[PDB]
Amino acid sequence: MGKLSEQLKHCNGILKELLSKKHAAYAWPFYKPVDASALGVHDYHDIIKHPMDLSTVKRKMENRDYRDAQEFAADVRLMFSNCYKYNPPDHDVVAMARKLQDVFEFRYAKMPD
Ligand SMILES: C[C@H](O)COCC(CO)(COC[C@@H](C)O)COC[C@@H](C)O
Ligand SMILES: C[C@H](O)COC[C@H](C)O
Ligand SMILES: [Cl-]
Protein backbone atom coordinates (compact mmCIF):
# COMPACT_ATOMS: atom_id res chain seq x y z
CA MET A 1 0.00 0.00 0.00
CA GLY A 2 3.05 2.22 0.43
CA LYS A 3 4.40 4.09 3.44
CA LEU A 4 2.28 6.99 4.69
CA SER A 5 3.88 10.40 4.34
CA GLU A 6 5.19 11.97 7.54
CA GLN A 7 2.09 14.15 7.80
CA LEU A 8 -0.21 11.18 7.27
CA LYS A 9 1.70 9.21 9.95
CA HIS A 10 0.82 12.04 12.34
CA CYS A 11 -2.81 11.84 11.16
CA ASN A 12 -2.83 8.10 11.72
CA GLY A 13 -1.48 8.68 15.22
CA ILE A 14 -4.27 11.14 15.96
CA LEU A 15 -6.82 8.65 14.63
CA LYS A 16 -5.47 5.88 16.86
CA GLU A 17 -5.68 8.26 19.80
CA LEU A 18 -9.30 9.18 19.00
CA LEU A 19 -10.15 5.46 19.02
CA SER A 20 -8.21 4.72 22.22
CA LYS A 21 -9.63 3.84 25.62
CA LYS A 22 -8.67 7.12 27.28
CA HIS A 23 -11.16 9.06 25.11
CA ALA A 24 -13.87 6.39 24.94
CA ALA A 25 -16.23 8.16 27.34
CA TYR A 26 -16.91 10.86 24.74
CA ALA A 27 -15.65 9.19 21.53
CA TRP A 28 -17.91 6.14 21.42
CA PRO A 29 -20.82 7.70 19.49
CA PHE A 30 -18.36 8.39 16.63
CA TYR A 31 -16.89 4.88 16.37
CA LYS A 32 -19.22 3.47 13.70
CA PRO A 33 -21.64 4.77 11.05
CA VAL A 34 -24.93 6.07 12.44
CA ASP A 35 -27.53 3.31 12.06
CA ALA A 36 -30.53 5.52 11.45
CA SER A 37 -33.17 2.80 11.58
CA ALA A 38 -31.72 1.30 14.77
CA LEU A 39 -31.89 4.68 16.52
CA GLY A 40 -35.24 5.65 15.02
CA VAL A 41 -33.76 8.79 13.46
CA HIS A 42 -35.78 8.44 10.28
CA ASP A 43 -34.84 11.93 9.08
CA TYR A 44 -31.08 11.45 9.50
CA HIS A 45 -30.27 10.77 5.85
CA ASP A 46 -32.48 13.62 4.70
CA ILE A 47 -30.48 16.02 6.85
CA ILE A 48 -27.00 14.47 6.63
CA LYS A 49 -26.00 14.05 3.00
CA HIS A 50 -22.44 12.88 3.72
CA PRO A 51 -22.21 10.59 6.75
CA MET A 52 -18.80 10.08 8.32
CA ASP A 53 -17.44 8.25 11.37
CA LEU A 54 -14.10 7.08 12.76
CA SER A 55 -14.29 3.51 11.42
CA THR A 56 -14.75 4.93 7.92
CA VAL A 57 -11.80 7.29 8.41
CA LYS A 58 -9.75 4.30 9.59
CA ARG A 59 -10.66 2.19 6.56
CA LYS A 60 -9.82 5.10 4.27
CA MET A 61 -6.42 5.53 5.94
CA GLU A 62 -5.67 1.80 5.68
CA ASN A 63 -6.69 1.84 2.02
CA ARG A 64 -4.52 4.92 1.32
CA ASP A 65 -7.59 6.83 0.19
CA TYR A 66 -6.33 10.05 1.83
CA ARG A 67 -3.71 11.70 -0.31
CA ASP A 68 -2.79 14.30 2.29
CA ALA A 69 -3.47 15.52 5.83
CA GLN A 70 -5.98 18.13 4.67
CA GLU A 71 -8.19 15.43 3.15
CA PHE A 72 -8.07 13.45 6.39
CA ALA A 73 -8.89 16.51 8.51
CA ALA A 74 -11.83 17.44 6.28
CA ASP A 75 -13.40 14.01 6.95
CA VAL A 76 -12.87 14.18 10.71
CA ARG A 77 -14.38 17.67 10.74
CA LEU A 78 -17.28 16.51 8.53
CA MET A 79 -18.05 13.87 11.16
CA PHE A 80 -18.25 16.54 13.88
CA SER A 81 -20.23 18.92 11.65
CA ASN A 82 -22.84 16.25 10.97
CA CYS A 83 -23.31 15.90 14.72
CA TYR A 84 -23.67 19.68 15.15
CA LYS A 85 -26.11 19.81 12.24
CA TYR A 86 -28.40 16.96 13.24
CA ASN A 87 -28.57 17.39 17.02
CA PRO A 88 -29.81 20.34 19.09
CA PRO A 89 -26.89 22.30 20.59
CA ASP A 90 -27.71 21.27 24.18
CA HIS A 91 -27.67 17.52 23.39
CA ASP A 92 -25.29 15.33 25.40
CA VAL A 93 -23.77 14.03 22.16
CA VAL A 94 -22.92 17.55 21.04
CA ALA A 95 -20.93 18.07 24.25
CA MET A 96 -19.14 14.78 23.50
CA ALA A 97 -18.36 15.92 19.95
CA ARG A 98 -16.94 19.22 21.20
CA LYS A 99 -14.64 17.38 23.62
CA LEU A 100 -13.39 14.94 20.99
CA GLN A 101 -12.94 17.78 18.51
CA ASP A 102 -10.79 19.59 21.08
CA VAL A 103 -8.57 16.50 21.29
CA PHE A 104 -8.45 16.37 17.49
CA GLU A 105 -7.79 20.04 16.74
CA PHE A 106 -5.07 20.50 19.34
CA ARG A 107 -3.10 17.48 18.14
CA TYR A 108 -3.73 18.19 14.45
CA ALA A 109 -2.23 21.63 15.09
CA LYS A 110 1.03 19.89 16.13
CA MET A 111 1.43 18.52 12.59
CA PRO A 112 5.05 18.35 11.43
CA ASP A 113 5.79 20.75 8.56
C1 LIG B 1 -25.05 10.37 25.81
C2 LIG B 1 -25.89 9.77 24.68
O1 LIG B 1 -27.09 10.48 24.56
C3 LIG B 1 -25.14 9.84 23.36
O2 LIG B 1 -26.02 9.43 22.30
C4 LIG B 1 -25.34 9.15 21.09
C5 LIG B 1 -26.34 8.75 20.02
C6 LIG B 1 -27.14 7.46 20.45
O3 LIG B 1 -26.22 6.39 20.65
C7 LIG B 1 -25.49 8.46 18.68
O4 LIG B 1 -24.87 9.68 18.31
C8 LIG B 1 -24.07 9.57 17.10
C9 LIG B 1 -23.51 10.92 16.77
C10 LIG B 1 -22.48 10.76 15.65
O5 LIG B 1 -24.55 11.75 16.34
C11 LIG B 1 -27.33 9.89 19.75
O6 LIG B 1 -28.18 9.52 18.69
C12 LIG B 1 -29.00 10.57 18.17
C13 LIG B 1 -28.37 11.23 16.91
C14 LIG B 1 -27.99 10.19 15.86
O7 LIG B 1 -27.24 11.93 17.26
C1 LIG C 1 -16.89 22.90 19.77
C2 LIG C 1 -16.60 23.36 18.36
O1 LIG C 1 -17.57 22.84 17.48
C3 LIG C 1 -15.23 22.86 17.97
O2 LIG C 1 -14.26 23.55 18.74
C4 LIG C 1 -12.96 23.01 18.62
C5 LIG C 1 -12.02 23.75 19.55
C6 LIG C 1 -10.61 23.30 19.31
O3 LIG C 1 -12.37 23.46 20.89
CL1 LIG D 1 -11.25 21.40 6.65
Side-chain angles (χ1 to χ4, degrees):
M1 293 309 303
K3 183 180 61 178
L4 293 173
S5 69
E6 184 171 6
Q7 290 198 337
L8 284 168
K9 294 281 195 178
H10 183 70
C11 291
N12 196 50
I14 294 167
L15 178 60
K16 287 288 298 180
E17 175 171 2
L18 299 184
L19 289 164
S20 73
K21 295 178 191 309
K22 70 174 70 288
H23 300 300
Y26 36 93
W28 70 261
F30 309 99
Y31 283 171
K32 292 288 162 57
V34 170
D35 182 340
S37 61
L39 296 179
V41 291
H42 301 299
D43 54 353
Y44 189 82
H45 295 290
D46 300 285
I47 291 164
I48 300 306
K49 308 315 299 194
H50 297 98
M52 186 52 55
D53 70 282
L54 294 173
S55 77
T56 298
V57 176
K58 186 74 172 73
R59 301 252 291 194
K60 288 177 69 171
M61 188 67 70
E62 292 166 356
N63 293 160
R64 303 298 189 260
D65 212 344
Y66 298 120
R67 294 203 62 232
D68 58 27
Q70 290 67 38
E71 194 184 349
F72 163 84
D75 264 357
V76 176
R77 290 162 174 163
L78 171 61
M79 177 186 80
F80 292 128
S81 295
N82 289 341
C83 186
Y84 307 141
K85 183 182 188 189
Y86 185 79
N87 298 282
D90 63 344
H91 199 287
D92 287 345
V93 76
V94 169
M96 296 160 86
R98 298 181 57 204
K99 285 163 65 177
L100 197 63
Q101 184 156 22
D102 191 89
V103 174
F104 171 73
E105 297 292 344
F106 277 86
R107 190 166 174 200
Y108 186 74
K110 298 175 178 59
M111 179 83 65
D113 288 314

